[PDB]
Design a binder for this molecule. Structure first.
Ligand SMILES: CCCCCCCCCO[C@@H]1O[C@H](CO)[C@@H](O)[C@H](O)[C@H]1O
Ligand SMILES: CCCCCCCCCO[C@@H]1O[C@H](CO)[C@@H](O)[C@H](O)[C@H]1O
Ligand SMILES: CCCCCCCCCO[C@@H]1O[C@H](CO)[C@@H](O)[C@H](O)[C@H]1O
Ligand SMILES: CCCCCCCCCO[C@@H]1O[C@H](CO)[C@@H](O)[C@H](O)[C@H]1O
Ligand SMILES: OC[C@H]1O[C@@H](O)[C@H](O)[C@@H](O)[C@@H]1O
Length: 476
């Protein structure tokens, strides 16, 4: 509950909007389907081809938007981290209002595409802000707060969706409740109020920018004040000197015309960047978004509306609760060890499920095992790979490519989200065993990847990497 902790709370407000925006549409989609009358032409008003295609575009728009958001964020952060947060809040305020008043597939598609862009901004900005506003020994611990409120956002959106009539019947013709028509729009409108809270927090209490940013553009004295404020100490010679060395290397870098595109042709920098993009993209091959995006579609085959609803609530609850231990584990045991154990937990989840489905595709025992395996996969991901990745991406790079490569890696993550989710939706309908055996193989490969190539980044100074040492960065 330090000061640096009030500051990360201010940044985690955007992380709450992150999680909320990702899961809000999925929660109340069926209501939109009936109201917008996407399948009013056919007998079934909830299940038709038109709904499937348009829902695919809606999900794709968020992912694509997130890709663009991550790319632009690399350029936007240059003018400030706190500035990025302010822009995010102002942006989400209008986008949420716009989404609240949509009446057609095109306007809501446009709204979600924008909402995705804001998400891509949050993906890079918030973990970077927390990175430069916390103690080096407590970076990881607070870095979990980012993932924590993401998880919390996903949970709150599901909880608010319980105020609904728990869904309209697919074969019925009963019109929605006037309350239900109002409430799903209000759910879209809720992050506008949250955005206002985010703006108020930054402009009233947390006016300062990060000490790293302030020092980088000349504000040395003002950098000292915010540095002394977050550390609660008059003597801040060591972290200031760490920033001074990082910034000086940035100045030498700009002189050598070093950029992300230029560093890629340098084998020393290419190595750490490729490793960063690999680790970032491999988070999606855990299949976590397959569950997040299609929680209803996955269990619609052997579970009814009420149980799917209960399952959704419990899944998001566990996904949120199991994030808390990461605050202690990430720093105490390290990031690499947690990643390795996380991969083991993922393997333990998918491989027995793959074997069970291969033996018998329609066994009752398989259905039950699939439910338990879900929670095993959720607990494993929520405690490790989820939180750690965004913490690691802002600890593994030298200062010259610190922000740019982190943005590139974040972009790859959302690109892989497109690569994993949509084909998985097609595969799991044909043969779940094949999809589950691919995830098992990927879980093993990811284990070996981290085990052999990934180094620990705990307690590292700002702008330092375990891969490239200071003197080695000078010859470049
Ligand atoms: C740019 C600000 C616009 C906000 C205007 C709010 C007016 C009252 C909102 O009630 C609206 O009543 C419509 C009747 O057709 C419904 O269709 C629509 O779903 C519902 O939202
Ligand atoms: C960000 C989303 C942008 C979507 C752009 C889609 C452009 C091509 C489709 O245009 C739409 O053709 C419909 C015919 O079905 C018309 O009914 C509707 O009035 C019109 O808008
Ligand atoms: C890691 C957890 C991933 C799960 C997140 C996706 C959950 C999507 C929300 O589902 C919906 O929940 C509503 C209750 O709010 C139900 O009324 C509705 O029937 C159901 O479709
Ligand atoms: C990658 C997202 C899912 C993570 C792992 C959770 C497995 C839960 C899904 O269970 C599977 O549901 C299929 C529905 O098609 C059934 O056919 C199959 O028998 C059953 O095993
Ligand atoms: O909590 C679930 C979320 O965790 C984040 O770490 C992943 O990047 C998201 O794709 C996932 O949806």
């Amino acid at each position: 509950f330090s000061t640096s902790f009030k500051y990360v709370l201010s940044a985690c407000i955007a992380s709450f909007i992150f999680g909320y925006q990702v899961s809000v549409l999925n929660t109340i989609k069926n209501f939109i389907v009936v109201e917008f009358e996407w399948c009013k032409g056919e007998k079934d008003r909830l299940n038709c081809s038109n709904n499937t295609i348009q829902s695919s575009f809606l999900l794709a728009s968020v992912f694509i938007g997130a890709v663009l958001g991550c790319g632009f964020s690399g350029y936007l952060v240059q003018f400030g981290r706190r500035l990025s947060l302010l822009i995010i809040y102002n942006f989400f305020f209008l986008v949420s209002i716009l989404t609240s008043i949509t009446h057609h597939f095109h306007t809501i598609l446009f709204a979600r595409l924008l909402s995705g862009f804001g998400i891509g901004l949050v993906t890079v900005s918030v973990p970077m802000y927390i990175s430069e506003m916390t103690h080096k020994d407590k970076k990881g611990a607070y870095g979990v707060m980012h993932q924590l409120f993401i998880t919390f956002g996903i949970f709150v959106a599901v909880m608010l969706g319980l105020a609904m009539g728990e869904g309209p019947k697919a074969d019925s013709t009963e019109p929605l409740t006037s309350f239900a028509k109002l409430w799903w729009r209000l759910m879209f409108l809720f992050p506008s109020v949250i955005s206002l809270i985010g703006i108020l927090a930054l402009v009233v209490f947390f006016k300062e920018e990060t000490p790293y940013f302030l020092f980088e553009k000349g504000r040395i004295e003002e950098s000292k004040n915010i540095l002394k404020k977050i550390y609660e100490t008059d003597n801040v010679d060591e972290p200031l000197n760490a920033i001074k060395e990082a910034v000086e290397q940035n100045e030498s870098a700009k002189k050598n015309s070093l950029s992300l595109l230029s560093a890629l042709k340098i084998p020393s920098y290419r190595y750490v960047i490729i490793l960063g993009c690999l680790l970032s993209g491999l988070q999606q091959f855990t299949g976590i978004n397959v569950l997040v995006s299609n929680s209803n579609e996955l269990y619609k085959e052997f579970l009814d509306s009420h149980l799917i609803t209960i399952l959704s609530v419990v899944m998001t609850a566990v996904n949120f609760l199991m994030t808390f231990p990461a605050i202690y584990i990430v720093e105490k045991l390290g990031r690499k060890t947690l990643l390795l154990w996380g991969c083991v937990g993922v393997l333990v989840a998918y491989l027995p499920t793959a074997i069970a489905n291969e033996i018998n595709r329609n066994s009752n025992f398989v259905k039950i095992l699939s439910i338990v395996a879900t929670f095993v996969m959720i607990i494993s991901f929520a405690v490790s790979y989820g939180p750690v990745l965004w913490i690691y991406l802002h600890e593994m790079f030298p200062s010259e490519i610190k922000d740019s490569a982190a943005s590139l890696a974040s972009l790859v993550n959302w690109v892989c989200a497109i690569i994993v989710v949509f084909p998985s939706d097609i595969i799991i309908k044909k043969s779940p065993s094949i999809l589950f055996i691919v995830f098992s193989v990927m879980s093993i490969l990811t284990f070996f990847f981290i085990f052999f190539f990934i180094k620990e980044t705990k307690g590292g100074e700002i702008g330092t990497s375990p891969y490239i040492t200071m003197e080695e960065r000078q010859k470049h």
